[PDB]
Amino acid sequence: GVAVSKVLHLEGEVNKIKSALLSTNKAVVSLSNGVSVLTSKVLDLKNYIDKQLLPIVNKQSCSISNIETVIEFQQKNNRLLEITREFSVNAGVTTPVSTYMLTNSELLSLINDMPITNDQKKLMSNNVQIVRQQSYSIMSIIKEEVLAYVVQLPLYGVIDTPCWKLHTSPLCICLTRTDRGWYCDNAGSVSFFPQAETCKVQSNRVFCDTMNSLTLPSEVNLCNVDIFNPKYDCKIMTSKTDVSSSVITSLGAIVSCYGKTKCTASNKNRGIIKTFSNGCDYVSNKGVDTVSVGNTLYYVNKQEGKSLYVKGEPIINFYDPLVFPSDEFDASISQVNEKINQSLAFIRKSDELLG
Amino acid sequence: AIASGVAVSKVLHLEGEVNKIKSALLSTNKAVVSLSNGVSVLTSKVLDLKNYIDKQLLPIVNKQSCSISNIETVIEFQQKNNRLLEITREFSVNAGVTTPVSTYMLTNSELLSLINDMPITNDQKKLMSNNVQIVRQQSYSIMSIIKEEVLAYVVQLPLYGVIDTPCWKLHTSPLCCLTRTDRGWYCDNAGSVSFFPQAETCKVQSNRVFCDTMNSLTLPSEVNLCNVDIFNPKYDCKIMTSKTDVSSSVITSLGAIVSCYGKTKCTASNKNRGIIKTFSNGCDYVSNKGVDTVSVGNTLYYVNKQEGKSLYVKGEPIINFYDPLVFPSDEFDASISQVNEKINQSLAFIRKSDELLG
Amino acid sequence: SKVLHLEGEVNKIKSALLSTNKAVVSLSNGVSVLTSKVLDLKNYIDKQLLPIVNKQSCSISNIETVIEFQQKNNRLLEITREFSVNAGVTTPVSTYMLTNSELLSLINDMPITNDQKKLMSNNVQIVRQQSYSIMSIIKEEVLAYVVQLPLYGVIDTPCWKLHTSPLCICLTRTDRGWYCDNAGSVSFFPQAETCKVQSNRVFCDTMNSLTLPSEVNLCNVDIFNPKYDCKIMTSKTDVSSSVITSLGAIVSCYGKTKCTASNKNRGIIKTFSNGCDYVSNKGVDTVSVGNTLYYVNKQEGKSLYVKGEPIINFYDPLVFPSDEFDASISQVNEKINQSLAFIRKSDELLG
Amino acid sequence: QNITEEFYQSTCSAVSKGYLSALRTGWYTSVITIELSNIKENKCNGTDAKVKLIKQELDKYKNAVTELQLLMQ
Amino acid sequence: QNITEEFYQSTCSAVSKGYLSALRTGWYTSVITIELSNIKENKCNGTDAKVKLIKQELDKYKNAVTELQLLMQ
Amino acid sequence: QNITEEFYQSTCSAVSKGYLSALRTGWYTSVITIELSNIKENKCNGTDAKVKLIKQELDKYKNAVTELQLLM
Numbered sequence A: 001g002v003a004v005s006k007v008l009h010l011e012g013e014v015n016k017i018k019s020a021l022l023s024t025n026k027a028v029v030s031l032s033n034g035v036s037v038l039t040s041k042v043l044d045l046k047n048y049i050d051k052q053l054l055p056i057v058n059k060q061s062c063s064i065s066n067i068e069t070v071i072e073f074q075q076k077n078n079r080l081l082e083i084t085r086e087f088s089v090n091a092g093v094t095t096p097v098s099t100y101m102l103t104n105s106e107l108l109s110l111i112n113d114m115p116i117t118n119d120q121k122k123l124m125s126n127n128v129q130i131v132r133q134q135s136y137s138i139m140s141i142i143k144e145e146v147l148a149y150v151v152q153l154p155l156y157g158v159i160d161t162p163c164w165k166l167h168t169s170p171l172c173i174c175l176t177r178t179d180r181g182w183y184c185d186n187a188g189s190v191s192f193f194p195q196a197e198t199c200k201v202q203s204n205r206v207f208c209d210t211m212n213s214l215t216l217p218s219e220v221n222l223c224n225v226d227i228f229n230p231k232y233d234c235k236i237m238t239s240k241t242d243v244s245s246s247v248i249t250s251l252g253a254i255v256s257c258y259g260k261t262k263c264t265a266s267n268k269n270r271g272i273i274k275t276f277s278n279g280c281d282y283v284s285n286k287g288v289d290t291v292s293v294g295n296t297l298y299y300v301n302k303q304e305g306k307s308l309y310v311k312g313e314p315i316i317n318f319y320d321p322l323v324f325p326s327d328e329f330d331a332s333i334s335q336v337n338e339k340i341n342q343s344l345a346f347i348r349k350s351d352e353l354l355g
Numbered sequence B: 001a002i003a004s005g006v007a008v009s010k011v012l013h014l015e016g017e018v019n020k021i022k023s024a025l026l027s028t029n030k031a032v033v034s035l036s037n038g039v040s041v042l043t044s045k046v047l048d049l050k051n052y053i054d055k056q057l058l059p060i061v062n063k064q065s066c067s068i069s070n071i072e073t074v075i076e077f078q079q080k081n082n083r084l085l086e087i088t089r090e091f092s093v094n095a096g097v098t099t100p101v102s103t104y105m106l107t108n109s110e111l112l113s114l115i116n117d118m119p120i121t122n123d124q125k126k127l128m129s130n131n132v133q134i135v136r137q138q139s140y141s142i143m144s145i146i147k148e149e150v151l152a153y154v155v156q157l158p159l160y161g162v163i164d165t166p167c168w169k170l171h172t173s174p175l176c177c178l179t180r181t182d183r184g185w186y187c188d189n190a191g192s193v194s195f196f197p198q199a200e201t202c203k204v205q206s207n208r209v210f211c212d213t214m215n216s217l218t219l220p221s222e223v224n225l226c227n228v229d230i231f232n233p234k235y236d237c238k239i240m241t242s243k244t245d246v247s248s249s250v251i252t253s254l255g256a257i258v259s260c261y262g263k264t265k266c267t268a269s270n271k272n273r274g275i276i277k278t279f280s281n282g283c284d285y286v287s288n289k290g291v292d293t294v295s296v297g298n299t300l301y302y303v304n305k306q307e308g309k310s311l312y313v314k315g316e317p318i319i320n321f322y323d324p325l326v327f328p329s330d331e332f333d334a335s336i337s338q339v340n341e342k343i344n345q346s347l348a349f350i351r352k353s354d355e356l357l358g
Numbered sequence C: 001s002k003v004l005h006l007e008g009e010v011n012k013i014k015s016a017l018l019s020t021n022k023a024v025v026s027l028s029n030g031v032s033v034l035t036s037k038v039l040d041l042k043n044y045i046d047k048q049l050l051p052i053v054n055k056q057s058c059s060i061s062n063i064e065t066v067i068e069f070q071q072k073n074n075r076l077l078e079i080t081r082e083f084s085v086n087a088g089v090t091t092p093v094s095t096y097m098l099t100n101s102e103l104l105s106l107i108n109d110m111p112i113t114n115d116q117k118k119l120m121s122n123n124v125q126i127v128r129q130q131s132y133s134i135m136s137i138i139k140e141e142v143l144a145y146v147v148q149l150p151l152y153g154v155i156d157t158p159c160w161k162l163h164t165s166p167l168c169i170c171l172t173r174t175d176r177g178w179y180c181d182n183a184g185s186v187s188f189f190p191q192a193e194t195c196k197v198q199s200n201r202v203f204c205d206t207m208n209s210l211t212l213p214s215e216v217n218l219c220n221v222d223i224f225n226p227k228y229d230c231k232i233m234t235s236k237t238d239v240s241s242s243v244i245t246s247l248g249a250i251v252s253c254y255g256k257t258k259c260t261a262s263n264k265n266r267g268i269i270k271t272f273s274n275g276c277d278y279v280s281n282k283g284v285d286t287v288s289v290g291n292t293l294y295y296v297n298k299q300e301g302k303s304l305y306v307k308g309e310p311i312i313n314f315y316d317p318l319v320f321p322s323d324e325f326d327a328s329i330s331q332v333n334e335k336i337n338q339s340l341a342f343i344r345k346s347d348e349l350l351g
Numbered sequence D, E: 001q002n003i004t005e006e007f008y009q010s011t012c013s014a015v016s017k018g019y020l021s022a023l024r025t026g027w028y029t030s031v032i033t034i035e036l037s038n039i040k041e042n043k044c045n046g047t048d049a050k051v052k053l054i055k056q057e058l059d060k061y062k063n064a065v066t067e068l069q070l071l072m073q
Numbered sequence F: 001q002n003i004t005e006e007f008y009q010s011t012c013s014a015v016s017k018g019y020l021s022a023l024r025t026g027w028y029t030s031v032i033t034i035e036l037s038n039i040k041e042n043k044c045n046g047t048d049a050k051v052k053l054i055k056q057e058l059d060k061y062k063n064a065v066t067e068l069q070l071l072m
């Protein structure tokens, strides 16, 4: 071939291959900056996490450590705080003994420890609502970390004795007995309990406090059959005029009718089922409900009425977790280390062409 | 080895360009290796940031989203069962029977709902609606059926037999020694007079007394003739006697009574005027208007209640604060769009390069 | 030979170039994908994580406010509770209603002796048990009630308690209760519910009390005493009982019934002839009358305990390994600062 | 003013006139029921696993009810 | 100590001597007023969109207050 | 139905018979001691620096305890 054309065409090359390389250089610089700006933003993200996000997440984690402990405080300390409250409200002493002051399992524990009979232990065990209404509770030592208080339980000196609850009305010059209340066969005598506050009554069981009781001899019962008795002086209230009033009892009622006063009985479904002559009559609660004496109505029977209801629907808690799409992320990082692995391939293939 | 004179200078020059262009491209390669190891370690890090967010910090944001759900519920349980939880408490505290009927056991809507359902007259229904405080203080509440998911108790209101009867209350003091002992509340039942002797069973509001007839005595209208004469022949007044001189005071609803007898020294002071009366031997009655004090010897009775220091407990409003976290996304989506403009224009340099080969 | 061999370089050196250019478009592609992934991770912290972290931040703030509500208003919320349960009037005056610092503050304002103030300021349990708290004005943002305390007209006067029993016709004195001296005479307190007693210090309300002459005390030595007409109860038949006094007990054994004064340590240590008797709680522990036992003393029982253990508040903070991370980002910057060194050299051999 | 006081030196006593009255002569009963707004335990973990607010708050309740179920007999 | 108990065969009664008295004869009345620390309800959004605790605590309160306001007449 | 009602006209008194009695004649005092499950606090910074719930719940308890100590 021509040999100046081989130099002028060869020169054509060396130039088209220099202007070539000068473009590839602006390409690696263009990219050195895109990586340098992407690099700073990866540092602004790691820094938004380390200096902004992470710190809040730590305080939120601390504020829930607080909240969850204030509640686990009042929950685990549920009993001690209910005691300190009702000692506060009652300024030291409380009656009756609550189920915070003393749980039931413990009460029974105590009952089985008192110096009493297996038949007295058995009684109290069955009437706890009553053994409690008759027990006190008394603060002794209270320090920050512990609270000790004495509990005071009753002890019965006698059990299984006949009791009777005496009611009375006028009798016409009029006469009214004024020794109403409870009577109990104490050893050899009758024990009488004037105030109806010192006697609790469960079913056919009666617990009484012999502290403000008078002791009477058994003759006091002859009174029931005759006011004027040679053996015992009955307690009476004399009036020199006619007087009428009802005395509703446990199982029924009494009705003293004397003079121009009109006393009738009635039924809820039947109406006036009776009228009273001037006399001392007794009406059972099985038959009669109310009892008009003059214009003042007496209700011989508790009157059932409107039932009320209050409904509460379950409350729903919603917890919707957060989940990062991590696998599709790692597959693109995998793809990016692919473009790097093979990016270095082509440069190695290139360096071998330069021997 | 060299052919002249076929431009020898131009051939020797190109032998130079090729040795420089060869070292040039060797260095160019070395840049693309560094930039590639650099992009390699950055990718690695952009990954450890995804693994910190996902394996470290997401476990904690979620543990929190659960803690906060548990909490919000335990509160909302103590909050929605607010009425129940109080009730079941005061049954625990009174062991199953509480008096009076608290505003937790029976609300006011419900109390009036129950009052219009009682078997009584428009006038009793109207009297109880206007003293709900007293009707409560006279009621009971007994727990009947307590199950885990529903509690049922029986409230117990009072029903009155008679209303708008005239009542009166007797205080008594020594007379020189006699001392009347039928002290207490009297009310008129049909025809007769009911006498409630314990101070416990009668509640007074305004001008209106509510008494329990459960343990009352029934007396003739002739006890009213006892206030005027103690030895009234139409009724035997129970009196309390003593063969010696006594002195005292007794504070009534609207004043007081001074039994001044013997060598004792009694007087009645007023807060502003001081002593306004010394007492001679006899039974005197002093108004709670004029007199605020009555002294009997060395003991001081108070005819009028004593106003005291007024106390205040001040409270300031609680201010809630939280911290919103806002991210600078716009400035960030720009420094990304510019990273992307660099790749677009870097690829254009390779495309210009290969457009030259050629 | 020359121009030929050189046209054979320009080929090899043109091949390594197409191989380099492909290496650059490889990286440029793998970096275009990294970039979008940093933008996808940013967009996660922004549109996803943040919105929950902010909702949680707010919810944490509602809870705090509610628990701080109950904590700051503790006292007022305890007060509206027992005004709700007791229906507007309460007794005693709780420590919520009046704090000890305030009760002493009031006891110093009251119109009384200094010996009174000091009595009341030592007996604050009794003083509260005798006071009422009455509700006067309740509004949404301020509840106002009235506290009502005892004012003691007299003090430091001698008191005594009277326990009685049958004496055998039988004679049982029915004047049991507390007596105190008053200016001149004596005051009697029948229903034992009016009298509060602490240590050796009686606190009696004189609303339902009975003014007696000083001679009601001779009744203790003689019933048929000619100075006072001793209130007495009569029975034409025989009776036997015991009444447990404060420092012992009285035992009335009469007729055929059998009484004895037992001991927890010794056993039955005495038997009772017909008559009135008195045993001290220093010597006897119980006292049988027929088939009914009376405990002269209180019976100390089994001690219960109820342990409890501490509650931690779990704190395990987050720590990000940033110093290592900032060193790697500084290394990526060192591979770029040097990559640019090489491209500057290459560009230098071409001018 | 309705209410007044009268004083008698003859008997040395004082009456307080002017009250209208209501004498309770019976009882009226009513049965009120109420239901539990029950919480369902949320199963999953919080910040501290050793802590079960929802569970404890129920056993706190259950046991109150139990302790009351033992007084009725 | 000071408290001694004396027995009397004649009347079959015992008498505790040694106590010192304090006879209530008047009332002292203070008017104690107590203010509320109130809670505004910050209005962002929480974890649970339904749960309105600040409003349910305020309304549980303004409710208790209305039952008492109704009690007095 | 052990409980029965008898009515008299000679005294005008009704009477409830058929109860069985227990009569208190002494007391039995047991001593109950209840420990506090105290909270051992790990102090830290929270959402709102002005709200320390652990601390305040305790100060509110410590104070209620103090008000009781002053009744003895």
Ligand SMILES: *[C@@H]1O[C@H](CO)[C@@H](O)[C@H](O)[C@H]1NC(C)=O
Pocket: A334, A337, A338, A341
């Ligand atoms: C990339 O190449 C390296 C070295 O040969 C190898 O360890 C790795 O498994 C390859 N895969 C990727 C894309 O990381």
Ligand SMILES: *[C@@H]1O[C@H](CO)[C@@H](O)[C@H](O)[C@H]1NC(C)=O
Pocket: B337, B339, B340, B341, B342, B344
């Ligand atoms: C990049 O190149 C493409 C094609 O011309 C274009 O769609 C895009 O807007 C350009 N910008 C960037 C930085 O992605």
Ligand SMILES: *[C@@H]1O[C@H](CO)[C@@H](O)[C@H](O)[C@H]1NC(C)=O
Pocket: D043, D044, D045, D049
């Ligand atoms: C949560 O923690 C508990 C206690 O370690 C464990 O029993 C349970 O498997 C864990 N996972 C979940 C989501 O309940």
Ligand SMILES: *[C@@H]1O[C@H](CO)[C@@H](O)[C@H](O)[C@H]1NC(C)=O
Pocket: E043, E044, E045
């Ligand atoms: C967030 O709060 C505002 C104010 O309650 C409300 O209008 C908006 O709908 C809520 N939701 C979001 C995510 O903006």
Ligand SMILES: *[C@@H]1O[C@H](CO)[C@@H](O)[C@H](O)[C@H]1NC(C)=O
Pocket: F043, F044, F045
């Ligand atoms: C974070 O809490 C610690 C520990 O209570 C405290 O010392 C510090 O002042 C608080 N702030 C920082 C950022 O340390």
Ligand SMILES: *[C@H]1O[C@H](CO)[C@@H](O)[C@H](O)[C@H]1NC(C)=O
Pocket: C330, C333, C334, C337
């Ligand atoms: C890299 O280059 C920049 C610009 O010259 C310079 O500021 C920096 O100090 C150099 N070294 C590193 C690793 O930052």
